Amino acid sequence: YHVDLTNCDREPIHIPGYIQPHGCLIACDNAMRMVLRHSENCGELLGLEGDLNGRTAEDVLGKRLVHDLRNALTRPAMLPAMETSDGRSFDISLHRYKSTTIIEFEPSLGTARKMVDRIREADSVESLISRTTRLVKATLGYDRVLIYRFEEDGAGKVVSEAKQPELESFLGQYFPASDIPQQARALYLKNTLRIISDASGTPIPVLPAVDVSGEPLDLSYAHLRNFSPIHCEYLRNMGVAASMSISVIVDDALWGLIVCHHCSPRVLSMPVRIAAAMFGEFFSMFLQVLKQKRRLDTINHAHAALDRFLRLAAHRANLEELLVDSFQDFARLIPCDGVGLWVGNNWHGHGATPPHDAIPRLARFVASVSEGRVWATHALSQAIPEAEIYADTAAGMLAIPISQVKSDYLLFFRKEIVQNLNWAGNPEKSYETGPMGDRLTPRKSFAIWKESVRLQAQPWSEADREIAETARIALVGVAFHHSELMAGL
Ligand SMILES: *C/C=C1/C(=C/C2=NC(=C\c3[nH]c(/C=C4/NC(=O)C(C=C)=C4C)c(C)c3CCC(=O)O)/C(CCC(=O)O)=C2C)NC(=O)[C@H]1C
């Protein structure tokens, strides 16, 4: 077995058989009686000799320490400043997973509260995320701090950045979903924090990698777990020697990551990591609440806007004329780059929309698939091949029925997503490569993403769809109310 670009999507990164060099690791049985595995550097760090496997935990660590560890017993217990029998001092991380006890040893001020105080008053998602990269960079001292937000398809967008002036910007850039494989996302979801202390360091083998019964050691919750050589190469091509990531959990899902990159080796001590993880939890909670508030404000605004229109309709004899005069104002309901009105087989457009002569084909399509419901796509050329030609202007379409009887619609459009990019990076910046080649570089990642979203628009969110359904009911309703008046006209 060797990992490469053909099979890295399935790399079993939870069982790498190695740890990072800034600590050592002992695996014991579920009762913590016997040593089953140990990293090769345990002898050096703990002051021991030969094969530790088979020796008892007490033999290896001391009765005192084993007692304290048992008492501490999948969320790892953090025990700063513990001592082994001979007086060597360690920050110890202890957990049980799959009924194996894993003990991690690192040879070894109100920070979290003060950091959290500086974000608690953020009053929008942007205000929260902008200040956080700045704050985390200043407090933790990394050369770059980013926040990635995952799109619905899994792609990452770099939504905030604080960096050393001489580093290139990645702000507004996207990376393909495949840049972080599924197993990596599963581990990000399980552990608040992920540390890479030295990307160019030499990893330390776990002894044995595979036990007598054929089982590998599952290091899913071990902070010393080594990382993929694919990512190692990616980091090295970027000039990045160390990282720490904080998982952003919103509504029980992985919303994104706060990622700290350092151009030289770096690892935070256990007490600072505890503070950073606590910060991450509060950041996640506050973000969750701010997203929810923004959604509420958006729905509230839309209802008020629909009421304003209904108020006008109550003083107009001719609803169709009112719609022809007003339809552009519905662009305020749902973010869009254009909007149009298809009523009585005539088209009226505003903003970025398909060309006038393309509309009858589009309207026939909408009438065939709507079935009196909101219908939406962010890949219009997949439904109408001829739409490819105008994808630069209108690649996404959301259609709202506005009559219970006639095939009349209000149509919202969005441009293909590359047209709305706001990328702060340097197009002249290039990257060196290793054996796997230029795939493992930001430049190439971004190019792959751009190619993957050709002819597609930003997807219509659940909130967009909810507003559209409310608008359908309002407009179908008022059309029915005016139907005798319009029959007369
Ligand atoms: C086929 C597998 C691939 C792969 C695997 C891994 N990626 C991991 C982390 C990771 N990779 C990236 C990708 C980036 N794309 C960019 O464009 C960019 C910067 C502009 C970056 C940094 C990211 C964002 C991350 C998240 C951590 C970080 O940002 O430093 C990963 C886990 C590493 C670990 O064990 O902690 C695996 C495994 N990466 C690939 O690119 C493909 C080929």
Task: Report the CATH number that the domain containing residue 219 is assigned in CATH.
Answer: 3.30.450.20
- Which residue in 112, 139, 125 sits closest to 277, CA to CA? 112
> Hey, whose CA ends up nearest to atom 10 of ligand 1?
180
Residue 148 shares a structural domain with residue 95: no
- Which residue in 118, 104, 236, 248 sits closest to 188, CA to CA? 248
Query: Cα 167 to chain center, whole Å?
Result: 23
Whole-number Cα distances in Å, 381 to 152, 293, 387: 20, 35, 5
Residue 195 shares a structural domain with residue 56: no
Q: Tokens for 236? A: 């090295």
Q: Write down the H helix ranges in 314-404.
A: 319-326, 359-369, 380-383
Experimental method: X-ray
> CB of 394 within 8 A of CB of 370?
no
The domain total for the chain is 3
Ligand 1: nearest atom to the Cα of 439: 43
Phi, psi of 427 (to 5 degrees): -70, -20
Within 8 A by CB and 6+ apart from 454, the residues are 391, 416, 418
> Hey, whose CA ends up nearest to atom 17 of ligand 1?
442
Residue 376 shares a structural domain with residue 451: no
Residue 405 shares a structural domain with residue 366: yes
Residue 30 shares a structural domain with residue 103: yes
Query: Cα 212 to chain center, whole Å?
Result: 39
Residue 185 shares a structural domain with residue 299: no
Task: Report the CATH number that the domain containing residue 172 is assigned in CATH.
Answer: 3.30.450.40
- Which of 6, 133, 168, 179 has the most ligand 1 atoms within 8 A of CB, as the residue to mutate? 179
Positive or negative, the Cα torsion across 142, 144, 148, 154?
negative
Measured distance CA(258)–CA(265) in Å, rounded:
18
Long-range contacts of 326-331 (CB under 8 A, 24+ apart): 327/410, 329/305, 330/410, 330/412, 330/471, 331/412
- Please tell me what resolution, in angstroms, this structure has: 2.0
Q: What SS3 state is found at 183?
A: helix
Residue 282 shares a structural domain with residue 369: no
Residue 6 shares a structural domain with residue 121: yes
Phi, psi of 247 (to 5 degrees): -75, 135
β-pair partners for 78: 93
β-pair partners for 347: 342
Q: At what angle do helices 462-481 and 270-313 cross, to 10 degrees?
A: 10
The residue out of 175, 194, 226 marking a domain boundary is 226
H or E stretch at 239: none
* Biggest CA pair distance of the chain: 99
Q: Which amino acid is at 293?
A: K
Query: Tokens 């990257």 identify what position?
Result: 431
Q: What is the DSSP string of 161-172?
A: EEE-TTSPP-TT
β-pair partners for 156: 150, 175
Q: At what angle do helices 270-313 and 125-140 cross, to 10 degrees?
A: 170
Residue 217 shares a structural domain with residue 238: no
Q: Which amino acid is at 422?
A: N
C-alpha 341 – ligand 1 centre gap (Å):
45
Whole-number Cα distances in Å, 403 to 140, 407, 486, 489: 58, 7, 12, 16
CA atoms within 13 A on the CB side of 343: 23
Phi, psi of 381 (to 5 degrees): -65, -25
Residue 418 shares a structural domain with residue 283: no
> Hey, whose CA ends up nearest to atom 38 of ligand 1?
228
Residue 467 shares a structural domain with residue 337: yes
Query: Tokens 């190692």 identify what position?
Result: 232
Phi, psi of 265 (to 5 degrees): -60, 150
Q: Which domain holds residue 352?
A: 293-425+456-489
Measured distance CA(147)–CA(21) in Å, rounded:
27
Q: What residue ranges line ligand 1, CB within 6 angstroms?
A: 5, 8-9, 13, 156, 170, 173, 175, 178-181, 184, 194, 196, 227-228, 230-231, 234, 243, 245, 259, 439-440, 442, 445
Residue 330 shares a structural domain with residue 214: no
Ligand 1: nearest atom to the Cα of 146: 29
Q: Which amino acid is at 57?
A: A
Measured distance CA(107)–CA(59) in Å, rounded:
20
The residue out of 176, 193, 226 marking a domain boundary is 226
The residue out of 226, 241, 267 marking a domain boundary is 226
